[PDB]
Amino acid sequence: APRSVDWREKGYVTPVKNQGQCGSCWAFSATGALEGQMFRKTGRLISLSEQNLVDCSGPQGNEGCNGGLMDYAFQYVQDNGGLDSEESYPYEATEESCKYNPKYSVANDTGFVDIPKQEKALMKAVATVGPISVAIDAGHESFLFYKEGIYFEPDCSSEDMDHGVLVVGYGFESTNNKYWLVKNSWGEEWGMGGYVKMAKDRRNHCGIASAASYPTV
Template identity: 65%
Template sequence: MQTISVLAVLALVFSCSLAYDVALNQPWKLWKELNNQRYSDAEEHVRRGIWEGNLKKVQQHNFEADLGVHSYWLGMNKYAAMTTDEFVKVMNGYNATMKGQRTQDRHTFTFNPLADLPDTVDWRDKGYVTPVKDQGQCGSCWAFSSTGALEGQHFKASGTLVSLSEQNLVDCSGAQGNMGCNGGLMDQAFEYIKENAGIDTEDSYPYEAVDDQCRFTKANIGATDTGFTDITSKDESALQQAVATVGPISVAIDASHGSFQLYKKGVYNEPFCSQTRLDHGVLAVGYGTDSGKDYWLVKNSWGEGWGDQGYIKMTRNKRNQCGIATAASYPLV
């Protein structure tokens, strides 16, 4: 989206005869091949410099993680040749500054402090979760979070797991306040689905990673909702109960850090994460404890090559880290 302008600035930074490590020539070539990355000569110069800088960060972090300093590890994924600022502008599309256009479809989750909840939940094991998807270079994370939550609730009600169309939401929910690849909100997506009396299947309305004309077809509806429920903001106990008793839940997080961009495995713990500066929509599909550390099991929409096969374990019960419980909701079916 904003790659060209960013590259112009970066070219100035890396134009001063930057000497690359020749020992990394083959790893760089292999990384490009594995991640299907092709660059012009000018862009190659810039990307190589960013990639080497990120490689040093990953190696240092993982050395410390192996020593027990960190609870998670980083990896040289397909985003390793992007700066963090560039990455956030391109990939993160949850727009917390938006205001919902309507409120009549909103309900509030009823928290029961006496509820006996399981220690571990993973809705993938119960058939509620479709395979990891890839939003591409389009700020449509909010659409993937929305479809993920509805896919789970539709399965709960019908016993059939149907992959739903993110492109339908990208193209058609502007009246509810969403802006396609330029951002949106999950609740506004749920509003659209109710008012539209449904959302098409992924097969009938495949993803394009660009804004396009609305092509919703009533005959291809895969699911619908009757509104949505918001979970008490910043209450991780309420979110835990919702995940345990309802199913996968749409959540918004602060994903603006390089540590998130390059996350590979382990329990992600980013002390500089914000509870309120939310910029990315994802799906909480479970929770548990790993080596004594509580975590949320979160499905992302950056493909299986990111994180732990497309998933991340995010710190749980640590003052709502990254704002995971700040704006959580799910559709009613």
């Protein structure tokens, strides 16, 4: 694979969003990945509706503002035959009745791919596909209060993940210096404009390769 990848530089990635006081991280991870794959396919970047996922993907197993899985979101989009745009179905950070309207659908998917649970495989996938949904262990004050540089938490778990985010690339600092470029959903005042550089090739730090996946389109 290349030594560095950054899909943001190719137009694959919407600006950093903010989930607010709703446990919808999984919905932002899933819209991020689908935004990327729709861009790959069509050349058009259109921001997608997390609220549509929050309100409507219960049947697939998601739990609204209480949590969910990116693969269940990808399944919803396939089952449903569409997903509305962010503009048409804006984000409210609370649960409400499903208001999906097929007239405003701007995305589709045909399923999803679960990546092997190794960082080499995750790198392969990022290098070829685009941005990738990942699970991480973000349950640490060091993460909540992260500002700069490559994030490494000695007490991170590779099994107990609690937050869905989006890998948009990877690289290295200087010339234990590799990182994953990770888009969060906590607004642009957290981290590096809303991004974190997660330690890469340090034995699956924080579980970043433990539940990685993307939608097929």
